mmCIF file of all heavy atoms in Angstrom:
data_model
loop_
_atom_site.group_PDB
_atom_site.id
_atom_site.type_symbol
_atom_site.label_atom_id
_atom_site.label_comp_id
_atom_site.label_asym_id
_atom_site.label_seq_id
_atom_site.Cartn_x
_atom_site.Cartn_y
_atom_site.Cartn_z
ATOM 1 N N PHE A 19 99.573 99.597 78.334
ATOM 2 C CA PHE A 19 100.356 100.627 79.009
ATOM 3 C C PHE A 19 99.688 101.990 78.885
ATOM 4 O O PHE A 19 99.616 102.752 79.856
ATOM 5 C CB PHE A 19 101.757 100.639 78.400
ATOM 6 C CG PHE A 19 102.731 101.576 79.059
ATOM 7 C CD1 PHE A 19 102.804 101.701 80.441
ATOM 8 C CD2 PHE A 19 103.612 102.312 78.278
ATOM 9 C CE1 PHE A 19 103.742 102.547 81.020
ATOM 10 C CE2 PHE A 19 104.540 103.160 78.850
ATOM 11 C CZ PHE A 19 104.604 103.278 80.220
ATOM 12 N N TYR A 22 96.766 102.214 81.259
ATOM 13 C CA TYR A 22 97.232 102.440 82.623
ATOM 14 C C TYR A 22 97.578 103.912 82.830
ATOM 15 O O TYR A 22 97.164 104.533 83.821
ATOM 16 C CB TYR A 22 98.446 101.549 82.922
ATOM 17 C CG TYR A 22 99.156 101.946 84.203
ATOM 18 C CD1 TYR A 22 98.623 101.610 85.445
ATOM 19 C CD2 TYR A 22 100.347 102.662 84.173
ATOM 20 C CE1 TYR A 22 99.259 101.999 86.619
ATOM 21 C CE2 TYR A 22 100.984 103.055 85.337
ATOM 22 C CZ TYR A 22 100.435 102.722 86.558
ATOM 23 O OH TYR A 22 101.066 103.105 87.720
ATOM 24 N N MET A 23 98.364 104.483 81.913
ATOM 25 C CA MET A 23 98.755 105.881 82.042
ATOM 26 C C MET A 23 97.540 106.805 82.010
ATOM 27 O O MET A 23 97.494 107.796 82.745
ATOM 28 C CB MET A 23 99.744 106.227 80.935
ATOM 29 C CG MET A 23 101.143 105.674 81.181
ATOM 30 S SD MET A 23 102.373 106.303 80.013
ATOM 31 C CE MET A 23 101.793 105.569 78.473
ATOM 32 N N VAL A 28 98.093 110.675 83.175
ATOM 33 C CA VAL A 28 99.212 111.195 82.396
ATOM 34 C C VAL A 28 98.702 111.911 81.155
ATOM 35 O O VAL A 28 97.810 111.418 80.451
ATOM 36 C CB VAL A 28 100.150 110.040 82.004
ATOM 37 C CG1 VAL A 28 101.367 110.554 81.256
ATOM 38 C CG2 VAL A 28 100.580 109.238 83.240
ATOM 39 N N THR A 32 103.134 113.179 77.117
ATOM 40 C CA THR A 32 103.957 112.271 77.904
ATOM 41 C C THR A 32 103.589 110.819 77.613
ATOM 42 O O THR A 32 104.471 109.962 77.497
ATOM 43 C CB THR A 32 103.831 112.603 79.393
ATOM 44 O OG1 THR A 32 104.381 113.904 79.631
ATOM 45 C CG2 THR A 32 104.593 111.597 80.239
ATOM 46 N N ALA A 36 106.308 108.172 76.263
ATOM 47 C CA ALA A 36 106.506 106.976 77.071
ATOM 48 C C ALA A 36 106.220 105.719 76.271
ATOM 49 O O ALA A 36 106.968 104.738 76.356
ATOM 50 C CB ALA A 36 105.645 107.034 78.334
ATOM 51 N N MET A 43 116.614 99.185 81.722
ATOM 52 C CA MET A 43 116.484 99.216 83.178
ATOM 53 C C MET A 43 117.747 98.667 83.829
ATOM 54 O O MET A 43 118.220 97.591 83.456
ATOM 55 C CB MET A 43 115.347 98.320 83.665
ATOM 56 C CG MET A 43 114.832 98.728 85.025
ATOM 57 S SD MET A 43 113.521 97.693 85.664
ATOM 58 C CE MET A 43 112.376 97.600 84.285
ATOM 59 N N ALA A 78 107.938 110.125 86.497
ATOM 60 C CA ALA A 78 108.293 110.695 85.200
ATOM 61 C C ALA A 78 107.229 111.660 84.695
ATOM 62 O O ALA A 78 107.543 112.602 83.961
ATOM 63 C CB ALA A 78 108.545 109.587 84.180
ATOM 64 N N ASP A 79 105.973 111.449 85.082
ATOM 65 C CA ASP A 79 104.882 112.351 84.732
ATOM 66 C C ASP A 79 104.666 113.437 85.776
ATOM 67 O O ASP A 79 103.620 114.097 85.766
ATOM 68 C CB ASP A 79 103.587 111.570 84.489
ATOM 69 C CG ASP A 79 103.155 110.748 85.699
ATOM 70 O OD1 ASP A 79 103.981 109.995 86.246
ATOM 71 O OD2 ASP A 79 101.975 110.845 86.101
ATOM 72 N N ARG A 81 104.280 113.449 89.175
ATOM 73 C CA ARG A 81 103.523 113.289 90.415
ATOM 74 C C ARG A 81 104.498 113.243 91.586
ATOM 75 O O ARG A 81 105.544 112.584 91.513
ATOM 76 C CB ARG A 81 102.700 112.001 90.409
ATOM 77 C CG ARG A 81 101.416 112.036 89.587
ATOM 78 C CD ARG A 81 100.792 110.629 89.469
ATOM 79 N NE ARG A 81 101.608 109.760 88.629
ATOM 80 C CZ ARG A 81 102.046 108.552 88.958
ATOM 81 N NH1 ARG A 81 101.696 107.963 90.102
ATOM 82 N NH2 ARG A 81 102.881 107.923 88.127
ATOM 83 N N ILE A 107 103.017 99.045 91.454
ATOM 84 C CA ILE A 107 103.916 98.532 90.430
ATOM 85 C C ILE A 107 104.582 97.298 91.021
ATOM 86 O O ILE A 107 105.308 97.396 92.019
ATOM 87 C CB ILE A 107 104.981 99.576 90.056
ATOM 88 C CG1 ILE A 107 104.320 100.871 89.583
ATOM 89 C CG2 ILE A 107 105.944 99.012 89.018
ATOM 90 C CD1 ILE A 107 105.301 102.025 89.399
ATOM 91 N N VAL A 118 106.966 93.770 84.651
ATOM 92 C CA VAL A 118 106.480 94.911 85.422
ATOM 93 C C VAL A 118 104.976 94.987 85.221
ATOM 94 O O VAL A 118 104.502 95.183 84.095
ATOM 95 C CB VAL A 118 107.173 96.220 85.012
ATOM 96 C CG1 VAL A 118 106.741 97.333 85.944
ATOM 97 C CG2 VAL A 118 108.692 96.058 85.042
ATOM 98 N N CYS A 120 101.659 96.986 86.349
ATOM 99 C CA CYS A 120 101.195 98.239 86.935
ATOM 100 C C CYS A 120 99.681 98.224 87.015
ATOM 101 O O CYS A 120 99.016 97.839 86.055
ATOM 102 C CB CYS A 120 101.622 99.430 86.074
ATOM 103 S SG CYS A 120 103.390 99.542 85.855
ATOM 104 N N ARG A 129 104.404 94.777 81.256
ATOM 105 C CA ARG A 129 105.578 95.071 80.441
ATOM 106 C C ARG A 129 106.646 94.025 80.726
ATOM 107 O O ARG A 129 107.020 93.814 81.881
ATOM 108 C CB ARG A 129 106.068 96.489 80.726
ATOM 109 C CG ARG A 129 105.140 97.532 80.096
ATOM 110 C CD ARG A 129 105.264 98.926 80.691
ATOM 111 N NE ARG A 129 106.547 99.556 80.409
ATOM 112 C CZ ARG A 129 106.875 100.148 79.267
ATOM 113 N NH1 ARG A 129 106.087 100.093 78.204
ATOM 114 N NH2 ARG A 129 108.031 100.800 79.189
ATOM 115 N N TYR A 131 110.449 92.489 80.163
ATOM 116 C CA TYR A 131 111.833 92.817 79.869
ATOM 117 C C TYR A 131 112.662 91.536 79.804
ATOM 118 O O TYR A 131 112.432 90.593 80.577
ATOM 119 C CB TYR A 131 112.425 93.697 80.966
ATOM 120 C CG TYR A 131 111.931 95.130 81.005
ATOM 121 C CD1 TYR A 131 110.683 95.450 81.532
ATOM 122 C CD2 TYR A 131 112.737 96.167 80.555
ATOM 123 C CE1 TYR A 131 110.239 96.767 81.576
ATOM 124 C CE2 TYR A 131 112.310 97.483 80.601
ATOM 125 C CZ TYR A 131 111.061 97.778 81.112
ATOM 126 O OH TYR A 131 110.635 99.092 81.156
HETATM 127 O O1 LIG B 202 108.488 99.838 82.463
HETATM 128 C C1 LIG B 202 108.551 100.259 83.655
HETATM 129 O O2 LIG B 202 109.635 100.164 84.290
HETATM 130 C C2 LIG B 202 107.330 100.884 84.343
HETATM 131 F F1 LIG B 202 107.508 100.839 85.694
HETATM 132 F F2 LIG B 202 106.234 100.153 84.004
HETATM 133 C C3 LIG B 202 107.153 102.335 83.886
HETATM 134 F F3 LIG B 202 106.909 102.276 82.550
HETATM 135 F F4 LIG B 202 108.344 102.966 84.076
HETATM 136 C C4 LIG B 202 106.014 103.128 84.582
HETATM 137 F F5 LIG B 202 106.175 103.081 85.932
HETATM 138 F F6 LIG B 202 104.801 102.584 84.274
HETATM 139 C C5 LIG B 202 106.021 104.611 84.172
HETATM 140 F F7 LIG B 202 106.284 104.680 82.842
HETATM 141 F F8 LIG B 202 107.000 105.239 84.868
HETATM 142 C C6 LIG B 202 104.696 105.339 84.426
HETATM 143 F F9 LIG B 202 103.763 104.912 83.535
HETATM 144 F F10 LIG B 202 104.271 105.031 85.676
HETATM 145 C C7 LIG B 202 104.731 106.872 84.377
HETATM 146 F F11 LIG B 202 103.444 107.318 84.497
HETATM 147 F F12 LIG B 202 105.446 107.310 85.443
HETATM 148 C C8 LIG B 202 105.271 107.537 83.112
HETATM 149 F F13 LIG B 202 105.055 108.880 83.238
HETATM 150 F F14 LIG B 202 106.603 107.318 82.934
HETATM 151 F F15 LIG B 202 104.586 107.065 82.042
#
Side-chain angles (χ1 to χ4, degrees):
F19 185 42
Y22 168 77
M23 284 189 294
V28 183
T32 295
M43 203 181 311
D79 59 309
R81 283 171 290 128
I107 303 171
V118 186
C120 302
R129 286 161 67 80
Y131 288 77

